[PDB]
RNA sequence: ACCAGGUUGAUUCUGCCUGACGUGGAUGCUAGUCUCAUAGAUUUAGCCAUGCAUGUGUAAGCGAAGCGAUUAGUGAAGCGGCGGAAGGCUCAGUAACGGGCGAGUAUUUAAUCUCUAGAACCGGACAACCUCAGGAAACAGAGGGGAAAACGGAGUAAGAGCAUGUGUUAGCAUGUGAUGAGAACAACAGUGCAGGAGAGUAAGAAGCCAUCCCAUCAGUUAGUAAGUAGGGUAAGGGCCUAUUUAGACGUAGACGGGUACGGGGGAUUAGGGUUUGAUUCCGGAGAGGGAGCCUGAGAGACGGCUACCAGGUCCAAGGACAGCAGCAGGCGCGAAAAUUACCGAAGCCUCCAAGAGGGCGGUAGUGAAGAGACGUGAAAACAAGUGUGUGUAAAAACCACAUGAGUAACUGGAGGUCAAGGCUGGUGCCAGCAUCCGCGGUAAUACCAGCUCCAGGAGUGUCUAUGAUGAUUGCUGCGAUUAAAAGGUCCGUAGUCGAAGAACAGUACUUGUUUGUAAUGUGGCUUAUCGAGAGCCGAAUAGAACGAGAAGAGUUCAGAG
RNA sequence: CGCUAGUCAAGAACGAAUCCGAUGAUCAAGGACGUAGGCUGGAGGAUCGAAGACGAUUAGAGACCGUAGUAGUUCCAGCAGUAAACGAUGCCUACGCUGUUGUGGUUAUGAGCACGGCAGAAGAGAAAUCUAGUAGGGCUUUGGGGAGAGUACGCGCGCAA
RNA sequence: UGAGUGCAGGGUUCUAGAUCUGAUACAAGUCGUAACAAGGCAGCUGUAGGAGAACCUGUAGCUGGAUCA
């Protein structure tokens, strides 16, 4: 049926391709994700930014290039993903940095997720018990609880994250 | 259809009214009256949105049953009465006065004025005719009619009206170097000064304009109202004086020019 | 009289054009009676309906051209 | 019922023929080729049985459910 | 009843067309009014938008204008002499626009006699008026407007129409 | 922007079958929590029990009975006024004024706006009231009063058309004239109604351009093509009729037949494409099938009337009534689709209204059609429960605090394609399995089971249409010596295609400026714990108006051949 | 299309300082020719020989072989419209390596132009081989896994086949 | 202006039918052996006769022939 809402995953063309199976298995294992759908969701997000960079570099006009480059780079800096010293009002560096985006990887999006941040900031003994503190309300940000492990943490929120003891 | 249309679906109503798509299926169908349906707004949208003084239909009723609201000097009692551009709105209790103008985006907006500006409006001249008993007449854009005005006023000019006497006060014509306001098109709500006019036969005349902060733009005469005797404007315009910026210009102005 | 008008239509898939034509029946007045004939080009103006098929009237014409009935030199030169 | 033709259908499972009586109602299904075509080694048969008396034949054969009676 | 729509009509190429609607009132027609000569009888018809139209069934008289001398008179109508569309409307004496009619000439005779040049300007009219012949043409539409009005035939118009009457 | 298995004793090719992946319906087995959408379209535009979906009164049109009164009052039966032509449902018919873009006439328009703008007398009835009183019912009679801003007449303003001057063209002058009216009331301090001229809204008719398959359908048409004159209409017109002229349309597909609600849009997609559109917006048509119609500003109306045909219902047998492609609901038909639920609240529409009405619309209930976010433990310490408050029209859910606690996985597979066992027991070309290739004749990693593994996971298998696979439909981009494939040879019309040199012109061609897109989609930003969601911004297709450039295309010339 | 003379029209190629100036390429519909065998009418009839009849050979031969024998095989006036009608390679127009051998004209005797054969090479192609090399030049015909099937129904031509 | 309904015809789509005649599948039935080797008369295309049946015979053609001589 045709109805509201987008679809956020793309199914792989070959269901039993051995190099894909092994490399996916590793990354789910290491990062403590629920199933293959969590991973595929991040992959589509990553692809979208790569497409924008491609389009910008090949555009003929200057007005669009100067306008939309800035927006793309600023956004990815705020998420804490693309960390480099982009200088504005300088055409060459904008081109240089756009080229550096083109080999961005899903690992970089994964490491901004709250489940990984909690463990990485040494507030939990494993990526597993980090998830188990996001459930059951033990994790709090700016004085308010966050129930969802997929919460992507912007650059500089790290000062305000906290854990509290269990209710028992 | 067997007869005249009564309803109006919310997705079909003018983009100038600026009403939220999701809340309900209908919108108010303006009553017949002074301006066209595409160039005016019903009064009940003004009181609930543009200038918030009611929040429910029971309150909208009460305000007009008590006879509070005055438009062009007459008290109004139809909630679906159309108001248009250059159209003084007032509440005599608390002595408030407003004109109706466009945002730079082309939406409608109310602008607060003094009791001086509240005394006059502007319209455009559409036809001249002589009537039974050899009486000369003249007519205007918003369905206005005038008896024994100055004969020299020509079709296409713009005239200033005294609201208390309902007579014409001043006249201005379409010439190089006069101030213009933009009613319809790509550049609604812009304000500028005439560079040059190119005359066409049996078809609209093309007018070329310079903006106050340098930009040239041209449009057809059918979308322009002339809003001053020569140099400078009659009516007081908005908090921002009708300058429109591209997203590109907004970026340059925010983060600085691209250096060599 | 019957007037033919001709034009080209673009077919997007094959990136090429086809020739098309339409027939229009027009009113010719007695003031043009001897002057307009087959092959000539004509200008017509629009009006309210004159009959079941007729809506245009001939208003003037451009005569199918001759540059010159070419010169013959005198035998004396 | 829908055409008043009489057709041949195949009965899939191990003991499947025992789950059907004369004058039972059955629902019938396609073999999965592009046109209606024979599949495997069965000559000239073009459909297969799916349900008997409103219940799944797979459940009947494997004794997970019983006849409506 | 009667219709003015082109529902039933063929295409210009000769082919038939199919019907896509039942009939609509906004293309209704009405039966002809056949105005006869006789004592006045006129009917009032309620028309679209609530307007009224006046339909003459019988008429006795008309206003008739003299164009050269600029006066108008009111006179009886005798009979139709000629009708351009159909020979039948003449023999049954039915009134329409462009019918040519015989009238009482005496009022016109009394007026035109005052001009001392009258005989010299139009001898054939003068002769007709002596012989008791007086001919006029109807300009109004009786079935629409509810009355008949016209002008007296003079000069070359007489010369033209009299050739249509003669056996 | 991608491949794999299958003709042979092996090999290299042509070629088709099958697998692997989106999406629309149907269905097996299994199912913890919360949020956003959507549901008798496909078959029968089949048939329908019941209840509801359209009515409205003020200080201010007329006011009967009753009640009551020092000649007051009341409180209203009917009449009048305004609406019932919108919205809701469906896709039968239509290859067409059905669809897109421009333009504003040859037209009519209750309400509403601006300017302007009204000295008028007389008479009956109809309904309700009162007295009889019919009929099985549905529905009606006699007789007698009496109102209007209801109705008909009188005068009187006004006044269509026709003719001539003068200003196209209003207007004015003059002659002639059919027709022929008109509302006030209340003071809580206002509300109405007659005439004009211009607007505003809505139709009717028109201009240009685009529109499906069959040649085993090649000729079609005679109101047909045109002219003159008249009738008719709100209005142009063969719209209709009389006499004259023979036209009009076709291989660049006429005419006939079959099929179809049309767009904005949807699905797939590197690009070029291929498929669909009953279905939130716009426009069209219908109300069992056909046809006629009164009233009105507006209907060829069906929750109006009238007749036939097909079907029904009640009767006292004489007659009456009725039409769910509105909302619930029932029966059928099918492989196929929810509650005879609440609603002085939100968005709007209707009236004579500081109020009344609305199944239009909103709120929940039901269902693994679709789309988000999360449970099923951690190493010290875990959903779903419950109670208060909130929330709403009233609710439930959601959220806040406080109490208990310790519950929570299945579907398809394991010989190759294709991820994962020559494990143990039965069966012996049987019973079965297998999209394809192939297994089983007593030593079956392939059947039937046990046990371990694999894949996706609140989900997974199957059937059926379609897009991709596919350069196996080829514009980009395939083939024709031998695999399928160059007409036995010429002539020839329509069709498609056509020198050098010197000049010329602007309709195609390309491009500027201006128009042309609500939703959807596209580039963004901001707020619901997050993410779909919601709100605001910017640019945009095809199509049209006016300019510009002249290479290619086009037209002409001859001290060129 | 193969004996010799005489006669009657038109065509191809070659040589060269002739004339006209875009008159042209390809082709649904429509028209003309088309070995052999066959058919309608006339002439004729040597040789050969379908059908038919015998003799042998064989299990059986109706066939192959031998004897005999008819329609046809020839000519004139027509109908018909098919072939492994094949170099199984459409028609115009291009760009393209060498050696050798022909046929007809012309020649500074060095060579050319038209129509051919042959042998290598380089490229090409699944190979065999090359009318197949290079290529978005123009126009027509035509194929889309085997079978059923070039069959059924309708239609057009023909005396029939 | 016209619903309905008489009587003849057409145009479409389905369906019945004694009997005849195609095709396809027939584990392996009966009679021969026509093709693939010079397949025991080299094969094949057109046309015309004949015949239980494959097929045989005359006439013109082709090599995809058993010969590039």
Residue numbers in the entry:
A (entry chain SJ0): 2 to 169
B (entry chain SE0): 2 to 261
C (entry chain SL0): 79 to 155
D (entry chain SX0): 72 to 140
E (entry chain SI0): 2 to 168
Sentences from the paper on this structure:
By combining cryo-electron tomography (cryoET) with subtomogram averaging and single-particle cryoEM, we investigated the structure of eukaryotic hibernating ribosome dimers in the microsporidian species Spraguea lophii.
In contrast to our single-particle map, our subtomogram averages of the dimer did not suggest the presence of an E-site tRNA, lacking density for the acceptor arm of the tRNA molecule. Superimposing the Alphafold2 prediction of S. lophii MDF1 matched the density and was corroborated by our mass spectrometry data. In this position, MDF1 would mimic an E-site tRNA, as previously suggested. When comparing our single-particle structure with the subtomogram average, we find that the L1 stalk, when bound to the proposed MDF1 protein, is closed even further than when tRNA bound. This indicates that the proposed MDF1 would hold the L1 stalk in a conformation that is incompatible with tRNA binding. In addition, the beaks of the dimer-borne ribosomes are bent towards the large ribosomal subunit, in a similar way to the structure of the MDF1-bound 70S ribosome isolated from E. cuniculi. Our cryoET data, combined with mass spectrometry, provide evidence of the presence of the hibernation factor MDF1 in the ribosome dimer, which is exchanged by a likely deacetylated E-site tRNA in the purified ribosome. In contrast, neither our ribosome dimer structure, nor that of the monomer reveal the presence of a factor that blocks the polypeptide exit tunnel, as is the case for P. locustae and V. necatrix.
